[PDB]
Design a protein around this ligand. Structure first.
Ligand SMILES: C=C1[C@H](O)CC(=C/C=C2\CCC[C@]3(C)[C@@H]([C@H](C)[C@@H](CCCC)CCC(=O)c4ccc(O)cc4)CC[C@@H]23)C[C@H]1O
Lengths: 11, 237
């Protein structure tokens, strides 16, 4: 669902 | 007074803030430009400012000791719930008492009650925000206190959706004890207790402000949504 946020947190 | 671990926490948080807040505001030049005469002429510029600020808040949160150790799902809920509050807090650095505005280094990048309303926000909601900013500014906090409060704000066990509330609570308690100890090194009782009680009250105020805007928000029914950014859309739902 929260794909952009997830990416921002993993990088 | 401050143990090495408490000092280590502060050092990390100071460095996190310094990496994520640029007091020159040079990046503002890459935003959609501010427009003051529509009718929501400030919404593109202010939407970019919020989007940018959410990214900075994510940066800051990732450096909070133990935050990364939480599940991704808990990291996501904590950030979605806290982002606007941390933005309101961090924004106090630009806020100026003489004008009641957020001054970001130039007339064009100087935001007042009317500019915020041109972003589609109600005067009734904006007034408490200004009041908040004035009250915070009057506390005249050290940067150590400022970054610890931002951190404490993010890592709250009582945000909706948190699965691992004990773990989240353990982090916040370490931050809280560090904050309490910091204050006590700067002030004997009872001034220490009074200053901490004021910071606690400011966090409750932020929370009430979030809950009031999101109450409004959740109770709203494209032309403005079109002007938001993909990250703002995702975070704000
Ligand atoms: C880099 C900086 C600089 O210090 C400049 C900054 C200034 C901050 C400002 C000045 C302009 C207006 C800003 C961005 C405010 C936003 C537009 C707020 C308006 C507050 C409500 C009346 C957006 C609120 C909002 O859209 C919302 C709130 C709760 C929800 O559940 C859903 C949505 C909140 C903080 C306001 C932000 C900071 O990150």
């Amino acid at each position: 669902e929260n794909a952009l946020l997830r990416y921002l947190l993993d990088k | 007074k401050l143990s090495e671990e408490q000092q280590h926490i502060i050092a990390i948080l100071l460095d996190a803030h310094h990496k994520t807040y640029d007091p020159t505001y040079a990046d503002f030049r890459d935003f959609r430009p501010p427009v003051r005469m529509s009718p929501l002429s400030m919404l593109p510029h202010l939407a970019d400012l919020v989007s940018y600020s959410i990214q900075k808040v994510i940066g800051f949160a990732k450096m909070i000791p133990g935050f990364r150790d939480l599940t991704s799902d808990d990291q996501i809920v904590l950030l979605k719930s806290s982002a606007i509050e941390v933005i309101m807090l961090r924004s106090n650095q630009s806020f100026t008492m003489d004008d009641m505005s957020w001054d970001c280094g130039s007339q064009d990048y100087k935001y007042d009650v009317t500019d915020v309303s041109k972003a589609g926000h109600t005067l009734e909601l904006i007034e408490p925000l200004i009041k908040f900013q004035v009250g915070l500014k009057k506390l005249n906090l050290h940067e150590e206190e400022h970054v610890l409060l931002m951190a404490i704000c993010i890592v709250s066990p009582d945000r909706p959706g948190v699965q691992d509330a004990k773990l989240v609570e353990a982090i916040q308690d370490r931050l809280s004890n560090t904050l309490q100890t910091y204050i006590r090194c700067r002030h004997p009782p009872p001034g220490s207790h009074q200053l901490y009680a004021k910071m606690i009250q400011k966090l409750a105020d932020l929370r009430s402000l979030n809950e009031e805007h999101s109450k409004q928000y959740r109770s709203l029914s494209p032309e403005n949504s079109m002007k938001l950014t993909p990250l703002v859309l995702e975070v704000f739902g």
